[PDB]
User: Fold this.
Amino acid sequence: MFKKFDEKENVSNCIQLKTSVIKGIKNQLIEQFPGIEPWLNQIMPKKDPVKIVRCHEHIEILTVNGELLFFRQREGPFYPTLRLLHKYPFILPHQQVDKGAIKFVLSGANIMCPGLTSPGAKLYPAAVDTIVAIMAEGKQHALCVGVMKMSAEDIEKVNKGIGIENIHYLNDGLWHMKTYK
Amino acid sequence: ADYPLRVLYCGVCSLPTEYCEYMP
Ligand SMILES: [Zn+2]
Assistant:
């Protein structure tokens, strides 16, 4: 979603949200990510203004104190940024690709089922459309936010095709935008 | 039991230092 993204050519503007809208977005974050609820006072303090950075193709980025927390496109689901996920890795269920696939997902490629079924990888049960944190064999931190395009049982069985859609990866255009300011 | 984690990001490639390997 951010492979050729950058502030100049993609960010139209940045609106500050009213209290009515913030409570609604928090509620949607709760519904999507149940375990985030006890941490929201910490991620989005009462005291701090909440902004949406509006981007081309109806991408919105939620920011607090200039830190990028979540993003969505249209009124689709929210996805954590990788920076937020690194601070709170438990927000998302995990899938672990084999180390050979690291180079390809860091260049923006979608995850193919052999990256998840080969030795060194770890595939965990997941329904299609689940937002997952992509971990890497031998690596402590997540490198990609993905969406299951086949269920994890299908990925084991079909074993060919896109298993996981690459949505956001380390040093993509979103990653490079460290803060909004 | 205490969060947020503070992950060290490399000062040149901006990645976690375990991913430096992948950035020239
Ligand atoms: Zn580095």
Q: What stands out?
A: Residues 5 and 17 of chain B are 15 Å apart (CA to CA). The interface with chain A takes residues 3-7, 13-16, 18-19, 22-23 of chain B (CB under 8 Å). The two ends of chain B are 36 Å apart (CA to CA).
